[PDB]
Amino acid sequence: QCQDVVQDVPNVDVQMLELYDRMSFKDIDGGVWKQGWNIKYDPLKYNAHHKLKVFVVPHSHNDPGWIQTFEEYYQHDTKHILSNALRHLHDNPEMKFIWAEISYFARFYHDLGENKKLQMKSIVKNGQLEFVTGGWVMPDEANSHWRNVLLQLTEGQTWLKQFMNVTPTASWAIDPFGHSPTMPYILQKSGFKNMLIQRTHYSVKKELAQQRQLEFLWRQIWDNKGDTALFTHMMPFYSYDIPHTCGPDPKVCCQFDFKRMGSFGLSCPWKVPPRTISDQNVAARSDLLVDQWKKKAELYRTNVLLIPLGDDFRFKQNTEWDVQRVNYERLFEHINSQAHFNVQAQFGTLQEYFDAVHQAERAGQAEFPTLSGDFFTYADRSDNYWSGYYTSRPYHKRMDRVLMHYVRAAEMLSAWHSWDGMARIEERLEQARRELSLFQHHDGITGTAKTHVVVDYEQRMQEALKACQMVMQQSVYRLLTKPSIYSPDFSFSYFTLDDSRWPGSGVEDSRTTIILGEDILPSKHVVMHNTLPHWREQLVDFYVSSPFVSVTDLANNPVEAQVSPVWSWHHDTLTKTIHPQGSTTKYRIIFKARVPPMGLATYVLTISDSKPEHTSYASNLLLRKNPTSLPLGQYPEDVKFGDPREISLRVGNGPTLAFSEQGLLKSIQLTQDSPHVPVHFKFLKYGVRSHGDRSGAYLFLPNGPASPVELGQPVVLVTKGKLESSVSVGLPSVVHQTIMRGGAPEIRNLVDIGSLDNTEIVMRLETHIDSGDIFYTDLNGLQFIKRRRLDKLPLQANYYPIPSGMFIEDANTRLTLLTGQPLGGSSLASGELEIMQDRRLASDDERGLGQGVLDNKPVLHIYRLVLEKVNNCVRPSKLHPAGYLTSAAHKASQSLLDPLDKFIFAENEWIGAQGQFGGDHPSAREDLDVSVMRRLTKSSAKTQRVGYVLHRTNLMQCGTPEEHTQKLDVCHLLPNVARCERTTLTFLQNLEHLDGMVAPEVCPMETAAYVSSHSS
Ligand SMILES: OC[C@H]1N/C(=N\O)[C@H](O)[C@@H](O)[C@@H]1O
Ligand SMILES: [Zn+2]
């Protein structure tokens, strides 16, 4: 029934890994088309019975923040563009315009009076103004998680359906810096039929152009059948601006950008200005233009040609609308009337272009090639590879993943009930979804905006996190309070969230201490939420005011706990060391929480006068020369000291880890009987070129391979406990921690690059895995793609996005590094993995930002490190372009991206408290996730509707016998179901009415959406 995504290598015309292996990448001067060749065409190709149909598509690229904030651009530019578009399109029925960024459109439309709204709806309904993609933004494709790509698409398309009564089926992505197959994956499952991309490596444009493979059916790398395919048009030239969209010669094309004649402060750098079209010059000008068009048409298979007409924040001034429209109308009138050209040219929209292309295809005029793979890493020229932005502004990249999870948890927790309008749940969820969606912009999460714009995005995300916490905590109070006692005030804070890893220790002291005492408050309720649809255990930690605390569940069963000190690291300018200080006023308590699928579990923390029976205390060892005491307030175990030395640790039955005298992992032993496998962490630094092009927010242009960070004699802190042990070391710019809880370790790096200008800090893992030139990285948290290090490409070209994980393997051993934040990384030699931590760059990199990256702030990066024997696993063949995680690595990724949420009850007594919610929820197979649960209706709706997005990943079979699991039917999660429908992933179109109101589970690597309707 399901396609096998492991064992069948798809047969495609172009497979991007294979193409890379064969391509030359030489950067030769191609003439006027600098990165191509001098295109030749047969004038006799087009004739009376076979004309070239040309669609000139006006557009305006509007960045939702970049060098100005969203609101600054809206006020200065976009409100004028949209206001003038409305007027000019209304007045000029043949003029056309496409619009991509619904965040700006919604911002505009809600300032419009009813008359103008009506006018706007009319120009949409008549096809003059066409929305393309219809997402809130045009998202980055490298760093974004697929869940947030879907979130932002749904936010914009839901707005469009509600207010404009349209749903785009053509996508326009002219600016993300490289392109991912996650986009056609999501688009094709959201009703799309066509997409367009632009920023692909110049060598790839030349290669595909030569073969007329710029239009292709883009399928997923594992897709044998081709049911994922989406028609894709890649534009052939260096930019989406007018000089690079009319044809191969920008000196000619620039003369047809009528905004460049002087009064607009634009000119043509090729030194020939546009000239106003007149009767005396129209034949000559038409000749030049048609020649460019016919050359462009040579690169494509049909007689239908797409000519975008636009640039950044274009179509602003009334005079600009006039100058472009009138001059092009004069060219069209001449060209279309002169038979010798055999051209019919008109303003069009993107959908009109694709419709005409497919008519030609249906007429047998063309067949299109099939393609799989991705389009990373982009270079726009020479060796300028855009791998810098995989890491730029990493604090905000990590914040993206935190907010991603909190949006999911807030929508899920609140979905279980209908809420009175006074609760403001819808309002707060809309704000949170919109701020996270905005950040998916290709100058948001990418870290390529001006400093003040990064600040605006951070403030917006901070407000979104507060909104999520508010919704979550009201939801928990309702889900766990006896209904006849439940007495909400929708403004009150019943719980506060406690998050151990954001912003993180040494980033912000934001964590509340639970204050208990015999004379004040003996105990405190805490509640964990588990957004995943299976039972889950995870260690959780809280700060408490006494070491003498015991844990119980709400049946009053003792729960084993471990108390540890609260350690913070400080740069001691007196001693010039980085060393830990122990709190004397608070302590950490850790215990295993067990939480139902998509559910809640309540525990109680109680103080006592002496060591509790079921609470243990960690030992602590500080390794350094010249130690000084470390008192720990009331903590019962004395800190030990020693000179630096190698150490080994083992928690539970888990691996045994060995560390160097500098506190860095050196080996992992999986079992008592097994070998100590070399796995060495190392920190290195890249610099910047003194001569030649400089690294900046976009570009990574290292001055050679990385050099090891000089570590000196760092202070190492070892904490050894029954439930959790750790080794932490204060290195220059990084406090590096390895945490062991009895499985794959967790790594945390508190990265503070300080004032180290022109430095990029990298964390490398060195092993003996015989990986050669192969490694695997993920795309948007959705899939893992095989990469091959190519020595024909420079180091920065071998860097790829690491949005959630990467791995190397040989026949017997795999090492997988999972990340809690998108960063850039590579495997630059056999057996190595490396991932960039932060970068601080003093120069601009000539891509328009006009600043370096000098606004770094401490960030806590999190990882899981999974070493596994893989000789028994059924893996794809050598020729397959995908790889797949094991169960342990997938669960490890889930532990980083969707951890248990922790709530602390905010007052002394919670009357009517309950022990659990969701005990009856089905515990689904481990590869299945409920990516989204969202109530789609407000409380006054007679028929309530709840939408679910189900994703099943594909995990490697390695001989672990599959256990019993329960079928998950999302349509029966809420009572009184009246209908279950399969829908597009945006929930906007019903695709199947489901028998028995049962939502089937999905196939490996597939994602489906369902909407259940309930009588209320
Ligand atoms: O050079 C790339 C840069 N330049 C742009 N226009 O000049 C893009 O709109 C912006 O999103 C991008 O970051
Ligand atoms: Zn842009």
UniProtKB/Swiss-Prot annotation:
The signal peptide here is none
Pathway assignment reads:
Protein modification; protein glycosylation
> Its induction, per UniProt?
Inhibited by swainsonine and by copper sulfate.
A Pfam family it matches: Glyc_hyd_38C_2
- Mind telling me what this protein is named? Alpha-mannosidase 2
Instruction: Kindly identify the residues recorded as the active site.
Output: 175
Function of this protein?
Catalyzes the first committed step in the biosynthesis of complex N-glycans. It controls conversion of high mannose to complex N-glycans; the final hydrolytic step in the N-glycan maturation pathway.
Q: Which residues are exposed on the Lumenal face of the membrane?
A: 1-1016
Question: Which coenzyme or cofactor does it need?
Answer: Zn(2+)
One of the GO BP terms on file = encapsulation of foreign target
Major location (coarse)? Golgi
Question: What is this enzyme's catalytic activity, as reactions?
Answer: N(4)-{beta-D-GlcNAc-(1->2)-alpha-D-Man-(1->3)-[alpha-D-Man-(1->3)-[alpha-D-Man-(1->6)]-alpha-D-Man-(1->6)]-beta-D-Man-(1->4)-beta-D-GlcNAc-(1->4)-beta-D-GlcNAc}-L-asparaginyl-[protein] + 2 H2O = 2 alpha-D-mannopyranose + an N(4)-{beta-D-GlcNAc-(1->2)-alpha-D-Man-(1->3)-[alpha-D-Man-(1->6)]-beta-D-Man-(1->4)-beta-D-GlcNAc-(1->4)-beta-D-GlcNAc}-L-asparaginyl-[protein]
Keywords (A to Z) from UniProt: Disulfide bond, Glycosidase, Golgi apparatus, Hydrolase, Membrane, Metal-binding, Signal-anchor, Transmembrane, Transmembrane helix, Zinc
Extract the InterPro entries matched here: AManII_C, Gal_mutarotase_sf_dom, Glyco_hydro/deAcase_b/a-brl, Glyco_hydro_38_C, Glyco_hydro_38_cen, Glyco_hydro_38_cen_sf, Glyco_hydro_38_N, Glyco_hydro_38_N_sf
Name the CDD domains on file. Answer: GH38N_AMII_GMII_SfManIII_like (cd10809)
Location in the cell reads: Golgi apparatus membrane
Enzyme Commission code: 3.2.1.114
Q: Which GO terms describe its molecular function?
A: alpha-mannosidase activity; carbohydrate binding; mannosidase activity; mannosyl-oligosaccharide 1,3-1,6-alpha-mannosidase activity; metal ion binding
Bilayer topology reads:
Single-pass type II membrane protein
Tell me yes or no: is Hydrolase among this UniProt entry's keywords. Answer: yes
Q: Which free-text remark accompanies the cofactor?
A: Binds 1 zinc ion per subunit.
Subunit description: Homodimer; disulfide-linked.
Q: Which family does it belong to?
A: Belongs to the glycosyl hydrolase 38 family.
Originating species: Drosophila melanogaster
Residues given in the record as Zn(2+) binding sites: 61, 63, 175, 442
Task: Please give an example of a GO cellular component term from this record.
Answer: Golgi membrane
